[PDB]
Amino acid sequence: KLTPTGEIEHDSVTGEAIYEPGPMAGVKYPLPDDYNAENNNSIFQGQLPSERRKLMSPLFDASGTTFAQFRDLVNKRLKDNIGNPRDPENPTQVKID
Amino acid sequence: MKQNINIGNVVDDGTGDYLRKGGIKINENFDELYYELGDGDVPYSAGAWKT
Amino acid sequence: MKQNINIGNVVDDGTGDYLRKGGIKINENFDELYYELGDGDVPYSAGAWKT
Amino acid sequence: MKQNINIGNVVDDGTGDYLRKGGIKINENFDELYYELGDGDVPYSAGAWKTYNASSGQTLTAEWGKSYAINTSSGRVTINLPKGTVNDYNKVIRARDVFAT
Amino acid sequence: IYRAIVTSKFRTEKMLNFYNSIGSGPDKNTIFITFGRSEPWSSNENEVGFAPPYPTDSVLGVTDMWTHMMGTVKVLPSMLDAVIPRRDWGDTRYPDPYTFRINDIVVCNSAPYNATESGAGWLVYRCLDVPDTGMCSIASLTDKDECLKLGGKWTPSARSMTPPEGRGDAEGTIEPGDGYVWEYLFEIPPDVSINRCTNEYIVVPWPEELKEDPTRWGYEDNLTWQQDDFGLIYRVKANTIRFKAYLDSVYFPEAALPGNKGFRQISIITNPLEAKAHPNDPNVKAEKDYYDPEDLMRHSGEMIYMENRPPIIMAMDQTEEINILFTF
Amino acid sequence: DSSVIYRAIVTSKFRTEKMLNFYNSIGSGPDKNTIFITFGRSEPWSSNENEVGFAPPYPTDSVLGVTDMWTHMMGTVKVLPSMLDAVIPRRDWGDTRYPDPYTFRINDIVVCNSAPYNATESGAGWLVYRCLDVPDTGMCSIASLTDKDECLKLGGKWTPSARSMTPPEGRGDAEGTIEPGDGYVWEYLFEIPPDVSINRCTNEYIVVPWPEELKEDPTRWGYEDNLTWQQDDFGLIYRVKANTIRFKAYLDSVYFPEAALPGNKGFRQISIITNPLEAKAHPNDPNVKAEKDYYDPEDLMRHSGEMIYMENRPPIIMAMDQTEEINILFTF
Amino acid sequence: IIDSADKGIYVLNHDEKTWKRVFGNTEEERRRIQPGYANMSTDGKLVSLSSSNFKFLSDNVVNDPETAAKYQLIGAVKYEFPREWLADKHYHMMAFIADETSDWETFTPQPMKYYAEPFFNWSKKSNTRCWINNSDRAVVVYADLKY
């Protein structure tokens, strides 16, 4: 998203880039044609059905992706909570004995 | 055959081609382009000739 | 002018060319070295000349 | 040595290389294909050669299409060429004086 | 009747041996990490607040865990690091960003608010002395010096002006003025930082890995007087190791297939031996990164650590990550 | 509400594992730990120290505490790995001294041949059995249950009513007392040869064999006979789950006559050190790990190496021509 | 490979009668049976089939109200087990016997195996249960010499 004149903008003093639910955020998408032809139908069928769900970039025109193996998910993610500074306020994860 | 890897217009646009289709669009372009002179392993500053 | 792209690291991060930066950046990186060689949609093992 | 970049097979399949390893497999690919012909940032339609020095060895060897412009000043150059050469032929080698030693 | 103690260092020491003890092939430990039990704890297991039944240790408990085991992953020593809890100077979110206690360990340059200095990796300072005004942990004492002369903890009143700086020995912003004084340790190079560091826990360098570059770790600068030293981890007294592992669907597509209820419970194993068609055949320790539990001999190797969770559902093309921290 | 709440445990084996590792880490010369053990402080804690009930001050850990402990230090002794052994608490069949000699609980480990009353079989060293099953009648640790099987079905401990008739016997893999009749069943482990018994064994703690040392003789430990199905094994300590190592050391007046001399108030406090370096005349000289068994504290570099464990005692008085022995154990 | 449904153990009396599952008639203990791991050996009057596999569906019991309470908890479950005597030697066999008059038609988890009981061939004549040890060693068991 915000990328003034050369480069994406990361937030002050904490230096973190800014994402928004960018325009046309929620959209169906067509699944239009080609994969069935483009695949030839591999991946134990599901060729178009498998599809690689949701976020991942490969459409190739994108701000947020840059270059990595992995995009992390902070949701469905856990430090539990204990002890040390940093750490979550809500443990989202805990451990008992 | 330059195998132009295309982006739709501005950044953020839902259109594009693919990182998949770019794959082998990228690579053949190399191969095709490169295998001319680069002719497999190493490019030849003396040029590539194919009998 | 070779227009190397910088590379992001291993994790979602805001540093480096985001792929759409690379989009057309590498696609350029082609044509430059390509046009100097290809001069149009075909590459030349014999090289290319400019009137 | 072309540093060919794979992806696994069909789209959407598990197998493929990387976005991350996409680079520098792709970029160094540029350099080499460039670096012989280009020398630096820009390619040479007229081609590019790389100076081997009299200072370094009394001998260089065997680079098939890598052309040299040769110095004998420091020491006599004894240049040996690739051996046994299989069925290839057709391979021109280029040695020259960037100056006359 | 006598009194005796173990130094906190020995915590560290255990680790270093233990760190030494992961072997490559021969005669030194090899570590596999395993997940399993598609099976549901109980219909509830999914629900919020669900806590799986407290695990059981036994040849029986082993067998069952050994029974359900979905998949197995090795661990290379380079995925094992010493770590200490990260605390950055100036971070607003968390309390007292500006208030440091004696011997606390402070990271600098980590973040823009943190960052004093561009073009250098993270820094690690420890805070020797704290402002005079403050609060004592022992309510009876109003003097820092008296609180500490007795040894009760002291909380200083006055915040730090700036995060510390300089390679030198106690800096500490001592001359011009401050309540804090600062001792320097080492600098962390960026590449390791980004990839290793969890915002709770910085990664602490190994002595061997230290033996390689004192500079890349910024330790080359100092003073040891023992010649090479490098025992730096003693100074930080890290008792805690971080296991890092990488699960991928590809090695284990079967558990990755759409509709799996996922694996309930996790288990690590050390030095298992390969499957053999003929039991008289000589045993083989396990090199490859992943083994189907089948490709591993029944019960082979030892599992130190058993784990039970509410169900987690893996999915293909998803990539799941595990971190584990042992405090010795 | 807490979303994720999970449970995880470390096996008791991992205790063992650390140990076996830790045992590996004592080196000869190179790149594996070397251990010195030190005593000091002739100086009296306080005038009381002699009197009964006196507890010396609890030691202090600090660069300060180190220095002080490092200050008074009388003498130093190295440790060879062969003086380090794994051990488990010794329990003998039929031994009056200890409670219920005839009453054993599941998984307890029982030694045979240790003593005349114990001894079934002559011409063999000590035996080591574990007791798998106990008489059916008994009492449950969970007060709610009167059935052994039901007690155990929940997993609570069970104490059997009926005492053992005989100490277990047989090399035989299952073989406690199964056919004719009894409530107890007994599991066999290995037999201990007498000399080690005699020299190593403390009547509270049998000494447990190393896997390595086992690799040498399976027979001398009587382990050669069995059945493993993993091939060679020898990891026996895993099966017994020994968490405890025994340090053994021997002090003699001769290495340190000065602290041994008549009238010494003896040493108050003890300290162990790992991988210290020799004293050097020139500080730029490269460090040297310490081979010899004892060093006057001078011949050791100040503060070199790390000392894990500090100790304070009422004064103990060494004496010349005395030979004093120290044992320290560890449960990891 | 040898697979699918039957998993059958069958019992012969008669030889006019038929083949008869006993242990078989379960669905469950089928899964215990494994081609590589499961094995039978008889001694006299007893029969020993191996199972190196165990897991349970049922043995968990639910609600754990005590911990449910103290943890302010709903659900969880208890992890519970009946007792079977496992080989503590690695690979940790589990066994099943019909011990009465030979067979007698029930199989049970066993108060214990005499270790590695399957793979031990049964001899009537000079009755022994023999097997070949890994690391190629001949193991023989026999009973003898009540004085």
Side-chain angles (χ1 to χ4, degrees), chain B residues 26-27 30-31 34 38 40-43, chain D residues 1-6 17 21-33:
Chain B
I26 186 65
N27 191 28
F30 299 156
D31 187 7
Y34 166 79
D41 54 350
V42 52
Chain D
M1 181 62 182
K2 178 185 165 61
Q3 186 61 263
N4 185 330
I5 180 163
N6 61 38
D17 186 9
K21 302 300 182 181
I24 297 170
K25 182 178 294 296
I26 197 166
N27 187 28
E28 181 179 2
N29 191 341
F30 292 157
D31 183 11
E32 182 182 2
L33 65 80

PDB file of all heavy atoms in Angstrom, chain B residues 26-27 30-31 34 38 40-43, chain D residues 1-6 17 21-33:
ATOM      1  N   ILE B  26       9.549 -17.062 -17.382  1.00  0.00           N
ATOM      2  CA  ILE B  26      10.859 -16.603 -16.971  1.00  0.00           C
ATOM      3  C   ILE B  26      11.948 -17.510 -17.518  1.00  0.00           C
ATOM      4  O   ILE B  26      12.916 -17.039 -18.125  1.00  0.00           O
ATOM      5  CB  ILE B  26      10.909 -16.507 -15.437  1.00  0.00           C
ATOM      6  CG1 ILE B  26      12.216 -15.879 -15.019  1.00  0.00           C
ATOM      7  CG2 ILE B  26      10.735 -17.866 -14.761  1.00  0.00           C
ATOM      8  CD1 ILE B  26      12.319 -14.482 -15.466  1.00  0.00           C
ATOM      9  N   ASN B  27      11.795 -18.818 -17.350  1.00  0.00           N
ATOM     10  CA  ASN B  27      12.932 -19.712 -17.478  1.00  0.00           C
ATOM     11  C   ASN B  27      13.269 -19.983 -18.932  1.00  0.00           C
ATOM     12  O   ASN B  27      14.435 -19.907 -19.333  1.00  0.00           O
ATOM     13  CB  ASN B  27      12.643 -21.012 -16.743  1.00  0.00           C
ATOM     14  CG  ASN B  27      13.859 -21.877 -16.617  1.00  0.00           C
ATOM     15  OD1 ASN B  27      14.987 -21.383 -16.593  1.00  0.00           O
ATOM     16  ND2 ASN B  27      13.647 -23.179 -16.526  1.00  0.00           N
ATOM     17  N   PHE B  30      15.033 -17.123 -20.473  1.00  0.00           N
ATOM     18  CA  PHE B  30      16.445 -17.395 -20.267  1.00  0.00           C
ATOM     19  C   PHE B  30      16.940 -18.387 -21.294  1.00  0.00           C
ATOM     20  O   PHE B  30      17.695 -18.033 -22.202  1.00  0.00           O
ATOM     21  CB  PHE B  30      16.666 -17.943 -18.868  1.00  0.00           C
ATOM     22  CG  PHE B  30      16.256 -17.010 -17.809  1.00  0.00           C
ATOM     23  CD1 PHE B  30      15.911 -17.470 -16.559  1.00  0.00           C
ATOM     24  CD2 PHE B  30      16.183 -15.660 -18.074  1.00  0.00           C
ATOM     25  CE1 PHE B  30      15.524 -16.594 -15.589  1.00  0.00           C
ATOM     26  CE2 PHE B  30      15.797 -14.786 -17.111  1.00  0.00           C
ATOM     27  CZ  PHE B  30      15.475 -15.249 -15.866  1.00  0.00           C
ATOM     28  N   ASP B  31      16.468 -19.623 -21.191  1.00  0.00           N
ATOM     29  CA  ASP B  31      16.914 -20.695 -22.059  1.00  0.00           C
ATOM     30  C   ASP B  31      16.939 -20.213 -23.491  1.00  0.00           C
ATOM     31  O   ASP B  31      18.013 -20.039 -24.068  1.00  0.00           O
ATOM     32  CB  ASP B  31      16.003 -21.903 -21.922  1.00  0.00           C
ATOM     33  CG  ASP B  31      16.522 -23.096 -22.677  1.00  0.00           C
ATOM     34  OD1 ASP B  31      17.651 -23.025 -23.202  1.00  0.00           O
ATOM     35  OD2 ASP B  31      15.800 -24.107 -22.753  1.00  0.00           O
ATOM     36  N   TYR B  34      19.164 -17.219 -23.748  1.00  0.00           N
ATOM     37  CA  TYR B  34      20.536 -17.512 -23.355  1.00  0.00           C
ATOM     38  C   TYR B  34      21.125 -18.638 -24.182  1.00  0.00           C
ATOM     39  O   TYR B  34      22.244 -18.527 -24.694  1.00  0.00           O
ATOM     40  CB  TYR B  34      20.581 -17.857 -21.872  1.00  0.00           C
ATOM     41  CG  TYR B  34      21.860 -18.493 -21.434  1.00  0.00           C
ATOM     42  CD1 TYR B  34      22.993 -17.740 -21.201  1.00  0.00           C
ATOM     43  CD2 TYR B  34      21.927 -19.859 -21.242  1.00  0.00           C
ATOM     44  CE1 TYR B  34      24.156 -18.341 -20.778  1.00  0.00           C
ATOM     45  CE2 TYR B  34      23.065 -20.458 -20.833  1.00  0.00           C
ATOM     46  CZ  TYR B  34      24.184 -19.716 -20.609  1.00  0.00           C
ATOM     47  OH  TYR B  34      25.322 -20.361 -20.203  1.00  0.00           O
ATOM     48  N   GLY B  38      24.583 -18.536 -24.910  1.00  0.00           N
ATOM     49  CA  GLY B  38      24.963 -19.235 -23.711  1.00  0.00           C
ATOM     50  C   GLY B  38      24.952 -20.726 -23.899  1.00  0.00           C
ATOM     51  O   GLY B  38      25.589 -21.454 -23.136  1.00  0.00           O
ATOM     52  N   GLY B  40      23.549 -23.750 -23.481  1.00  0.00           N
ATOM     53  CA  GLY B  40      23.768 -24.615 -22.340  1.00  0.00           C
ATOM     54  C   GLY B  40      24.633 -23.932 -21.312  1.00  0.00           C
ATOM     55  O   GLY B  40      24.465 -22.757 -21.050  1.00  0.00           O
ATOM     56  N   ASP B  41      25.589 -24.682 -20.760  1.00  0.00           N
ATOM     57  CA  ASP B  41      26.263 -24.294 -19.523  1.00  0.00           C
ATOM     58  C   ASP B  41      26.668 -22.825 -19.523  1.00  0.00           C
ATOM     59  O   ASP B  41      26.077 -22.001 -18.815  1.00  0.00           O
ATOM     60  CB  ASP B  41      27.488 -25.185 -19.314  1.00  0.00           C
ATOM     61  CG  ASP B  41      28.420 -25.180 -20.508  1.00  0.00           C
ATOM     62  OD1 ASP B  41      28.025 -24.634 -21.562  1.00  0.00           O
ATOM     63  OD2 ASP B  41      29.552 -25.690 -20.388  1.00  0.00           O
ATOM     64  N   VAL B  42      27.640 -22.472 -20.350  1.00  0.00           N
ATOM     65  CA  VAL B  42      28.360 -21.220 -20.186  1.00  0.00           C
ATOM     66  C   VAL B  42      28.221 -20.413 -21.469  1.00  0.00           C
ATOM     67  O   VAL B  42      28.286 -20.978 -22.572  1.00  0.00           O
ATOM     68  CB  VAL B  42      29.826 -21.498 -19.806  1.00  0.00           C
ATOM     69  CG1 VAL B  42      30.454 -22.469 -20.779  1.00  0.00           C
ATOM     70  CG2 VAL B  42      30.636 -20.217 -19.750  1.00  0.00           C
ATOM     71  N   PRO B  43      28.003 -19.106 -21.373  1.00  0.00           N
ATOM     72  CA  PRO B  43      27.978 -18.283 -22.576  1.00  0.00           C
ATOM     73  C   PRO B  43      29.382 -18.080 -23.101  1.00  0.00           C
ATOM     74  O   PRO B  43      30.364 -18.080 -22.356  1.00  0.00           O
ATOM     75  CB  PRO B  43      27.361 -16.968 -22.089  1.00  0.00           C
ATOM     76  CG  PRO B  43      27.739 -16.896 -20.670  1.00  0.00           C
ATOM     77  CD  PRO B  43      27.682 -18.312 -20.171  1.00  0.00           C
TER      78      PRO B  43
ATOM     79  N   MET D   1      25.166 -24.996 -15.625  1.00  0.00           N
ATOM     80  CA  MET D   1      25.756 -23.740 -15.181  1.00  0.00           C
ATOM     81  C   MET D   1      24.832 -22.581 -15.536  1.00  0.00           C
ATOM     82  O   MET D   1      24.933 -21.487 -14.974  1.00  0.00           O
ATOM     83  CB  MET D   1      27.140 -23.551 -15.805  1.00  0.00           C
ATOM     84  CG  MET D   1      27.840 -22.280 -15.378  1.00  0.00           C
ATOM     85  SD  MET D   1      28.158 -22.238 -13.605  1.00  0.00           S
ATOM     86  CE  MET D   1      28.902 -20.620 -13.432  1.00  0.00           C
ATOM     87  N   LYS D   2      23.903 -22.847 -16.456  1.00  0.00           N
ATOM     88  CA  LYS D   2      22.902 -21.849 -16.812  1.00  0.00           C
ATOM     89  C   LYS D   2      22.063 -21.436 -15.605  1.00  0.00           C
ATOM     90  O   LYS D   2      21.383 -20.403 -15.646  1.00  0.00           O
ATOM     91  CB  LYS D   2      22.005 -22.390 -17.925  1.00  0.00           C
ATOM     92  CG  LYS D   2      20.897 -21.448 -18.323  1.00  0.00           C
ATOM     93  CD  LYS D   2      19.961 -22.044 -19.330  1.00  0.00           C
ATOM     94  CE  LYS D   2      18.719 -21.196 -19.362  1.00  0.00           C
ATOM     95  NZ  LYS D   2      19.050 -19.806 -19.772  1.00  0.00           N
ATOM     96  N   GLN D   3      22.111 -22.214 -14.522  1.00  0.00           N
ATOM     97  CA  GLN D   3      21.360 -21.916 -13.307  1.00  0.00           C
ATOM     98  C   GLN D   3      19.862 -21.938 -13.604  1.00  0.00           C
ATOM     99  O   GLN D   3      19.097 -21.053 -13.213  1.00  0.00           O
ATOM    100  CB  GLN D   3      21.812 -20.581 -12.702  1.00  0.00           C
ATOM    101  CG  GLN D   3      21.197 -20.237 -11.366  1.00  0.00           C
ATOM    102  CD  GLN D   3      21.533 -21.243 -10.301  1.00  0.00           C
ATOM    103  OE1 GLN D   3      20.750 -22.150 -10.022  1.00  0.00           O
ATOM    104  NE2 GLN D   3      22.699 -21.087  -9.685  1.00  0.00           N
ATOM    105  N   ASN D   4      19.450 -22.965 -14.339  1.00  0.00           N
ATOM    106  CA  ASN D   4      18.051 -23.093 -14.700  1.00  0.00           C
ATOM    107  C   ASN D   4      17.195 -23.210 -13.449  1.00  0.00           C
ATOM    108  O   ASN D   4      17.533 -23.914 -12.495  1.00  0.00           O
ATOM    109  CB  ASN D   4      17.838 -24.295 -15.611  1.00  0.00           C
ATOM    110  CG  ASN D   4      16.410 -24.407 -16.108  1.00  0.00           C
ATOM    111  OD1 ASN D   4      15.464 -23.992 -15.440  1.00  0.00           O
ATOM    112  ND2 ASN D   4      16.253 -24.938 -17.311  1.00  0.00           N
ATOM    113  N   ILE D   5      16.079 -22.499 -13.465  1.00  0.00           N
ATOM    114  CA  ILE D   5      15.208 -22.385 -12.309  1.00  0.00           C
ATOM    115  C   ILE D   5      13.999 -23.276 -12.542  1.00  0.00           C
ATOM    116  O   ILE D   5      13.249 -23.105 -13.510  1.00  0.00           O
ATOM    117  CB  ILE D   5      14.809 -20.931 -12.032  1.00  0.00           C
ATOM    118  CG1 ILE D   5      13.903 -20.858 -10.801  1.00  0.00           C
ATOM    119  CG2 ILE D   5      14.201 -20.271 -13.269  1.00  0.00           C
ATOM    120  CD1 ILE D   5      13.799 -19.474 -10.219  1.00  0.00           C
ATOM    121  N   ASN D   6      13.854 -24.269 -11.682  1.00  0.00           N
ATOM    122  CA  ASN D   6      12.730 -25.181 -11.747  1.00  0.00           C
ATOM    123  C   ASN D   6      11.501 -24.612 -11.054  1.00  0.00           C
ATOM    124  O   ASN D   6      11.587 -23.701 -10.232  1.00  0.00           O
ATOM    125  CB  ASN D   6      13.108 -26.522 -11.124  1.00  0.00           C
ATOM    126  CG  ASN D   6      13.481 -26.409  -9.655  1.00  0.00           C
ATOM    127  OD1 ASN D   6      12.891 -25.650  -8.891  1.00  0.00           O
ATOM    128  ND2 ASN D   6      14.487 -27.171  -9.258  1.00  0.00           N
ATOM    129  N   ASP D  17       9.817 -24.145  -6.957  1.00  0.00           N
ATOM    130  CA  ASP D  17      11.085 -23.825  -6.320  1.00  0.00           C
ATOM    131  C   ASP D  17      10.855 -22.964  -5.089  1.00  0.00           C
ATOM    132  O   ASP D  17      10.644 -23.487  -3.995  1.00  0.00           O
ATOM    133  CB  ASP D  17      12.005 -23.084  -7.291  1.00  0.00           C
ATOM    134  CG  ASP D  17      13.396 -22.846  -6.726  1.00  0.00           C
ATOM    135  OD1 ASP D  17      13.720 -23.403  -5.654  1.00  0.00           O
ATOM    136  OD2 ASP D  17      14.165 -22.084  -7.350  1.00  0.00           O
ATOM    137  N   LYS D  21      14.147 -18.408  -3.383  1.00  0.00           N
ATOM    138  CA  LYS D  21      15.169 -18.947  -4.268  1.00  0.00           C
ATOM    139  C   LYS D  21      14.863 -18.635  -5.720  1.00  0.00           C
ATOM    140  O   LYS D  21      15.701 -18.891  -6.593  1.00  0.00           O
ATOM    141  CB  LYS D  21      15.306 -20.448  -4.070  1.00  0.00           C
ATOM    142  CG  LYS D  21      15.651 -20.817  -2.654  1.00  0.00           C
ATOM    143  CD  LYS D  21      16.948 -20.205  -2.222  1.00  0.00           C
ATOM    144  CE  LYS D  21      17.280 -20.649  -0.817  1.00  0.00           C
ATOM    145  NZ  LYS D  21      18.544 -20.047  -0.329  1.00  0.00           N
ATOM    146  N   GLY D  22      13.667 -18.117  -6.000  1.00  0.00           N
ATOM    147  CA  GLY D  22      13.445 -17.494  -7.289  1.00  0.00           C
ATOM    148  C   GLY D  22      14.551 -16.516  -7.612  1.00  0.00           C
ATOM    149  O   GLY D  22      15.160 -16.579  -8.678  1.00  0.00           O
ATOM    150  N   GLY D  23      14.871 -15.645  -6.660  1.00  0.00           N
ATOM    151  CA  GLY D  23      15.961 -14.710  -6.870  1.00  0.00           C
ATOM    152  C   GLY D  23      17.313 -15.386  -6.727  1.00  0.00           C
ATOM    153  O   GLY D  23      17.445 -16.434  -6.091  1.00  0.00           O
ATOM    154  N   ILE D  24      18.315 -14.798  -7.389  1.00  0.00           N
ATOM    155  CA  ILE D  24      19.740 -15.106  -7.260  1.00  0.00           C
ATOM    156  C   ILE D  24      20.048 -16.435  -7.930  1.00  0.00           C
ATOM    157  O   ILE D  24      21.166 -16.671  -8.399  1.00  0.00           O
ATOM    158  CB  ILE D  24      20.176 -15.123  -5.784  1.00  0.00           C
ATOM    159  CG1 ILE D  24      19.985 -13.743  -5.162  1.00  0.00           C
ATOM    160  CG2 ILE D  24      21.628 -15.552  -5.649  1.00  0.00           C
ATOM    161  CD1 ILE D  24      20.155 -13.734  -3.662  1.00  0.00           C
ATOM    162  N   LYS D  25      19.037 -17.281  -8.053  1.00  0.00           N
ATOM    163  CA  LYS D  25      19.077 -18.267  -9.112  1.00  0.00           C
ATOM    164  C   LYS D  25      18.771 -17.574 -10.424  1.00  0.00           C
ATOM    165  O   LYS D  25      19.367 -17.876 -11.461  1.00  0.00           O
ATOM    166  CB  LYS D  25      18.076 -19.381  -8.814  1.00  0.00           C
ATOM    167  CG  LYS D  25      18.043 -20.509  -9.819  1.00  0.00           C
ATOM    168  CD  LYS D  25      17.053 -21.570  -9.386  1.00  0.00           C
ATOM    169  CE  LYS D  25      17.503 -22.251  -8.117  1.00  0.00           C
ATOM    170  NZ  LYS D  25      18.775 -22.980  -8.354  1.00  0.00           N
ATOM    171  N   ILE D  26      17.854 -16.617 -10.365  1.00  0.00           N
ATOM    172  CA  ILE D  26      17.475 -15.835 -11.526  1.00  0.00           C
ATOM    173  C   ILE D  26      18.446 -14.685 -11.741  1.00  0.00           C
ATOM    174  O   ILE D  26      18.775 -14.343 -12.882  1.00  0.00           O
ATOM    175  CB  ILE D  26      16.030 -15.362 -11.314  1.00  0.00           C
ATOM    176  CG1 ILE D  26      15.372 -14.898 -12.588  1.00  0.00           C
ATOM    177  CG2 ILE D  26      15.954 -14.205 -10.333  1.00  0.00           C
ATOM    178  CD1 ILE D  26      13.904 -14.789 -12.357  1.00  0.00           C
ATOM    179  N   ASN D  27      18.918 -14.076 -10.654  1.00  0.00           N
ATOM    180  CA  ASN D  27      19.725 -12.871 -10.759  1.00  0.00           C
ATOM    181  C   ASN D  27      21.146 -13.206 -11.170  1.00  0.00           C
ATOM    182  O   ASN D  27      21.690 -12.628 -12.116  1.00  0.00           O
ATOM    183  CB  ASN D  27      19.703 -12.131  -9.424  1.00  0.00           C
ATOM    184  CG  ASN D  27      20.366 -10.784  -9.501  1.00  0.00           C
ATOM    185  OD1 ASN D  27      20.401 -10.156 -10.560  1.00  0.00           O
ATOM    186  ND2 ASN D  27      20.888 -10.317  -8.372  1.00  0.00           N
ATOM    187  N   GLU D  28      21.765 -14.149 -10.467  1.00  0.00           N
ATOM    188  CA  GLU D  28      23.083 -14.599 -10.876  1.00  0.00           C
ATOM    189  C   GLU D  28      23.033 -15.157 -12.284  1.00  0.00           C
ATOM    190  O   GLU D  28      24.005 -15.056 -13.043  1.00  0.00           O
ATOM    191  CB  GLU D  28      23.595 -15.647  -9.901  1.00  0.00           C
ATOM    192  CG  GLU D  28      24.964 -16.170 -10.212  1.00  0.00           C
ATOM    193  CD  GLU D  28      25.404 -17.184  -9.188  1.00  0.00           C
ATOM    194  OE1 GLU D  28      24.601 -17.472  -8.275  1.00  0.00           O
ATOM    195  OE2 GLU D  28      26.540 -17.689  -9.287  1.00  0.00           O
ATOM    196  N   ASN D  29      21.895 -15.748 -12.648  1.00  0.00           N
ATOM    197  CA  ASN D  29      21.671 -16.141 -14.029  1.00  0.00           C
ATOM    198  C   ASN D  29      21.916 -14.963 -14.956  1.00  0.00           C
ATOM    199  O   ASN D  29      22.690 -15.065 -15.911  1.00  0.00           O
ATOM    200  CB  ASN D  29      20.250 -16.680 -14.189  1.00  0.00           C
ATOM    201  CG  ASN D  29      20.017 -17.347 -15.530  1.00  0.00           C
ATOM    202  OD1 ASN D  29      20.755 -17.131 -16.489  1.00  0.00           O
ATOM    203  ND2 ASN D  29      18.975 -18.167 -15.601  1.00  0.00           N
ATOM    204  N   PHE D  30      21.281 -13.823 -14.665  1.00  0.00           N
ATOM    205  CA  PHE D  30      21.564 -12.605 -15.415  1.00  0.00           C
ATOM    206  C   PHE D  30      23.053 -12.350 -15.479  1.00  0.00           C
ATOM    207  O   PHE D  30      23.632 -12.255 -16.564  1.00  0.00           O
ATOM    208  CB  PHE D  30      20.887 -11.401 -14.770  1.00  0.00           C
ATOM    209  CG  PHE D  30      19.410 -11.415 -14.857  1.00  0.00           C
ATOM    210  CD1 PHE D  30      18.657 -10.690 -13.960  1.00  0.00           C
ATOM    211  CD2 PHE D  30      18.770 -12.144 -15.831  1.00  0.00           C
ATOM    212  CE1 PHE D  30      17.295 -10.693 -14.037  1.00  0.00           C
ATOM    213  CE2 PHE D  30      17.411 -12.142 -15.911  1.00  0.00           C
ATOM    214  CZ  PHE D  30      16.675 -11.421 -15.013  1.00  0.00           C
ATOM    215  N   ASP D  31      23.690 -12.266 -14.312  1.00  0.00           N
ATOM    216  CA  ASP D  31      25.083 -11.854 -14.261  1.00  0.00           C
ATOM    217  C   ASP D  31      25.917 -12.687 -15.210  1.00  0.00           C
ATOM    218  O   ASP D  31      26.528 -12.159 -16.134  1.00  0.00           O
ATOM    219  CB  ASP D  31      25.631 -11.983 -12.846  1.00  0.00           C
ATOM    220  CG  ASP D  31      27.055 -11.484 -12.739  1.00  0.00           C
ATOM    221  OD1 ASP D  31      27.544 -10.854 -13.702  1.00  0.00           O
ATOM    222  OD2 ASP D  31      27.699 -11.741 -11.705  1.00  0.00           O
ATOM    223  N   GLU D  32      25.899 -14.004 -15.034  1.00  0.00           N
ATOM    224  CA  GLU D  32      26.764 -14.850 -15.841  1.00  0.00           C
ATOM    225  C   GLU D  32      26.478 -14.667 -17.323  1.00  0.00           C
ATOM    226  O   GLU D  32      27.372 -14.313 -18.099  1.00  0.00           O
ATOM    227  CB  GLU D  32      26.600 -16.311 -15.454  1.00  0.00           C
ATOM    228  CG  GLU D  32      27.521 -17.189 -16.262  1.00  0.00           C
ATOM    229  CD  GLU D  32      27.358 -18.652 -15.956  1.00  0.00           C
ATOM    230  OE1 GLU D  32      26.485 -18.995 -15.130  1.00  0.00           O
ATOM    231  OE2 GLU D  32      28.104 -19.457 -16.550  1.00  0.00           O
ATOM    232  N   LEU D  33      25.229 -14.907 -17.733  1.00  0.00           N
ATOM    233  CA  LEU D  33      24.869 -14.659 -19.123  1.00  0.00           C
ATOM    234  C   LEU D  33      25.286 -13.259 -19.523  1.00  0.00           C
ATOM    235  O   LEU D  33      25.860 -13.050 -20.597  1.00  0.00           O
ATOM    236  CB  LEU D  33      23.368 -14.861 -19.342  1.00  0.00           C
ATOM    237  CG  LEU D  33      22.290 -13.975 -18.701  1.00  0.00           C
ATOM    238  CD1 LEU D  33      22.086 -12.655 -19.436  1.00  0.00           C
ATOM    239  CD2 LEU D  33      20.967 -14.718 -18.589  1.00  0.00           C
TER     240      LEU D  33
END
